[PDB]
Design a protein around this ligand. Sequence first.
Ligand code: NI
Length: 715
Amino acid sequence: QHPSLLFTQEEVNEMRAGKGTVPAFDKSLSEVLAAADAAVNSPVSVPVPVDGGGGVVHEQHKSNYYAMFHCGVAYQLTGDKKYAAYVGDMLEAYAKLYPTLGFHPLQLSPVPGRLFWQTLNESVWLVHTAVAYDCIYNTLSSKQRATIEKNLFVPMADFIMDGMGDNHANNKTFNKMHNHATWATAAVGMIGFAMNREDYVKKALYGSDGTGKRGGFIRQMDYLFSPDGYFTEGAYYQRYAIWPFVIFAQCIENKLPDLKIFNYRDSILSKALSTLIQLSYEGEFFHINDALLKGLSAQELVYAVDILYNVNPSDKSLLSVANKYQHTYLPTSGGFKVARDIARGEAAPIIYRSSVFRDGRKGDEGGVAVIRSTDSNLNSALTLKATSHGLSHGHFDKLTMAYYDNGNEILPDYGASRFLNIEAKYKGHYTRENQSFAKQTIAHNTLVVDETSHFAGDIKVSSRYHSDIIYHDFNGGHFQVMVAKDTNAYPGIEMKRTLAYVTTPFLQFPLILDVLQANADKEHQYDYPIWYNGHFVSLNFPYAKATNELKTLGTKDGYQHLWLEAWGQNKSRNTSSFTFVNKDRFYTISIATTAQTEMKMLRLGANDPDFNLRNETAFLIREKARKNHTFATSIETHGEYDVVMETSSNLTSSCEEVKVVMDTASYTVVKATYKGGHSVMLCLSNTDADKEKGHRLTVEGTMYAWNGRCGVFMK
Ligand code: NI
């Protein structure tokens, strides 16, 4: 009967008999045992709660649940009674303390805990401590178990479910479709499994009323993901959210195998993990919405990989995720199996595929589209984000694009402004500049109208709406294309964005064409920003540069944070080109312009009194007093630049012209001309998205015929 949460007795016996046969697993287990030994060698401290996040007491109780977790696992994997004694002594200290605790003295959280300032931390503590208890259960006397369950576990589970006294806010969280409810239901269900309390299990799975209609872990699996396994807050918070799902699902599979939890909703948990992998580049998640440095190496993804690979070991690509990015394994049958199958040479390459991940519970509220390189000599990704808002972490970023190549982020998404766990920098919280800059439209690679963010930067307005991915073709032979549309970011303005990834026979690397159409009945200022990662090489037009004084580009909606470093116009050519270098590769952005277009080089860092912003750079194209406008862009990747060997070639752009050669209600046509008499013609049906519809168009005496929304012609 015990253990059964993280593993069964048979599985523990197997792991112990297998010691020495898989060195990588042995190394991970040794690290668990070292953590447990460190806890055992230290005095036990269970202080009266007095502080919030980062406080010494808060951090002590957090350390305690990790210590109990590690000691319970260590006891199971070694049989050494000192680990079980540690857990038992600490549980008896908690059972003495907990009956004396009212609501936490700190008046800050809308759902205050008793052990912690917020109930979320109480739930995380209980998940880990339920595992510890399960691991040491048989070493305790009946008297000890009765006291611990009566004075600690039953009151804590009841509190997480229902609150206390007159404050029942915890019950609203318990039944919510939210990550904090995933933790609360995992905590209550896992301690219910450990105590054989079927009522806790039922309410964790199906909500307080048991119907599954207005709460519960199962319903969360139906509501917190799209049908493609996409979590609407983004990839960084999807990483956080997947962790309690896979932990609790593994417990459910051990105790209730006939529920087939890992098949539920077409194996939604597997889809979540797959989506996380397909939304990463070089192991790092695309920094959409609020996001910090985080990727496939995170412990949440070690849990997800080891648990889900154990459920379907035919998915050998997961072994590569573990071997390339994780190098560590759970102390479970699944972690052992991952390390063992890696050692047997079974890992298969990770296959990154162009994809559309739909947003919304039903998949009908926008999406994220990713075009992936298909040539095995290359390593590139191009993203187009056309989602719902994204709840509290959402950015005002409809139709934003990003480009990744050659191991690097080339045209980036900024992510969040936040200095995790650095108390001296805004106590580690999201900074003022996360709201005033990082969420604003100008921080992104997308259209900004009249120096105003999408939805005027109002979360409640933005939360009404979503963009649409309206067309895609990832199998065009010589190209891939994706198209998105938004009509609510700026009421009265229709925005469309087409991104084509074209493999020409005449350029060194695949070409990207971007076409951003804005259609309005009133005049506006249209800003087209391209944030770039690298060092300035050249502009093909004259510019002025700040000499001894720098001023800001604007005053509001993020523009107050932008230094205006250089500015210029192109009076002599119809195409304006910016070349920069990133590591050993050059990139050229070429855009169709007129003599009235304004070009600006920007650098982040103004109005930043606390040094909360990075020194990032952008190339901005500004059009004044336009009703309809088409931004047409060629993005070239070119050149070999070896500083160690001191060699170089193809360092200059080959783009001679970008021109909109037709722009009617029915069709928009862009011609990009390259050295040697070569060209790419991109033909766009503006008014339908039918994959099978045929089109014919005449440009410059030549007839262009194609099927589907977008035609790509090369010569
Ligand atoms: Ni962003």
